[PDB]
Amino acid sequence: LRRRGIVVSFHSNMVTVEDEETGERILCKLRGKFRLQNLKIYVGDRVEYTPDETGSGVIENVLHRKNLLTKPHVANVDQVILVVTVKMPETSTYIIDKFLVLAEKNELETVMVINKMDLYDEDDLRKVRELEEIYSGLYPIVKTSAKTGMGIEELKEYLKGKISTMAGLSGVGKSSLLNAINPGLKLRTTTTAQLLKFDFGGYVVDTPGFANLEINDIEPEELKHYFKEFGDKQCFFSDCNHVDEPECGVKEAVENGEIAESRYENYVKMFYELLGRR
């Protein structure tokens, strides 16, 4: 009879589902009119199927998704674990804000993780204090070391229950942190993502988030809504883009220091970058 499950991967041209109750990995086939209609199914999709245990099962229906990450297709993602690096990979605030813009656009909770702390000397630490100085009040920050183990237990606290996606520049330590959180687990024909179950309940995606940092589906005038800070600020004009406009609460805030310059700076850069399109 009808049982609820979460899709976790696509094996041998078939959907692999996991039983929401207390189930194992039941392989499946989608039947019905999903054919007639165009109701596509993805990893992370919640579904209800028929347990013909005498050989896997059959997917009867696919629930409605809260969202759908793209390239590595993933549905119903709650969190973005943004792993950042001050030294070694060197992460610019610009890249960081593009990541946040993306996480916000897909309406996801974001947890910023400054990794490789074990490698930082005094100058590096200063750069760290600058990251906290910028993002402290906009997002949760956790200082970690995949090697030392520093900050992992605290990070396990955010992964619990939720379906999470790792994001960050190559080399920043995404796969190493994963293994630090759950020995054995690791980041990545077979072009679809997979959901890895955490020891403590919850899942993390096979491959990394928006690795292609593609901000195009965003209209210029839309971008401003993806910078938390820009909101409680009042600007003269109706829907002021905060760039040239004559009077801007946002521009005012920057001259004050209520808004980090880097934030404004990167937002404007991104703004103009989106304008170049017809």
Ligand X SMILES: Nc1nc2c(ncn2[C@@H]2O[C@H](COP(=O)(O)OP(=O)(O)O)[C@@H](O)[C@H]2O)c(=O)[nH]1
Annotated binding-site positions for GTP: 115-118, 168-176
**Tokens 């491959």 belong to residue:** 207
Task: Say whether residue 250 binds Zn ion (CB under 5 A).
Answer: yes
Cα four-point dihedral sign 200, 100, 186, 5: positive
Residue 250 touches which member of ligand X, Zn ion, none, C-beta under 5-8 Å by kind: Zn ion
Q: Which residues make up each annotated binding site?
A: 115-118, 168-176, 235, 240, 242, 248
Contact window for Zn ion (CB under 5 A) among 12-20, 54-62, 160-168, 241-249: 241-249
**How crowded is residue 252: how many other Cβ atoms within 10 Å of its Cβ?**
15
Decide: 210 and 197 in contact? Cβ < 8 Å. Answer: no
Strands (E) located in the chain: 3-11, 14-19, 25-30, 46-50, 57-62, 68-69, 74-75, 79-84, 109-114, 141-143, 163-167, 195-197, 203-205
d(CA 276, CA 278): 7
Decide: 91 and 172 in contact? Cβ < 8 Å. Answer: yes
Task: Say whether residue 154 binds ligand X (CB under 6 A).
Answer: no
Q: Which of residues 97-156 bind Zn ion (CB under 5 A)?
A: none
Task: Say whether residue 253 binds Zn ion (CB under 5 A).
Answer: no
Please pick, from the candidates 101, 248, 254, 270, the single residue that binds Zn ion as defined by CB under 5 A.
248
Contact window for ligand X (CB under 6 A) among 27-35, 73-81, 145-153, 270-278: 145-153
Contact window for Zn ion (CB under 5 A) among 65-73, 80-88, 183-191, 248-256: 248-256
Please pick, from the candidates 74, 101, 141, 172, the single residue that binds ligand X as defined by CB under 6 A.
172
Task: Say whether residue 221 binds ligand X (CB under 6 A).
Answer: no
Minimum gap (Å) between residue 144 Cβ and ligand X: 6
Number of shown-chain residues binding ligand X (CB under 6 A) = 16
Beta-bridge partner residues of 113: 83, 142
d(CA 235, CA 121): 42
d(CA 186, CA 113): 17
Please pick, from the candidates 235, 253, 259, 270, the single residue that binds Zn ion as defined by CB under 5 A.
235
| Strand, helix or coil for residue 135 | helix
Give CA angle at 271 (267, 272), nearest 5°.
125
Contact window for Zn ion (CB under 5 A) among 41-49, 101-109, 125-133, 245-253: 245-253
Residue 85 touches which member of ligand X, Zn ion, none, C-beta under 5-8 Å by kind: none
Residues that bind ligand X (CB under 6 A): 115-116, 118-119, 145-147, 168, 170-176, 187
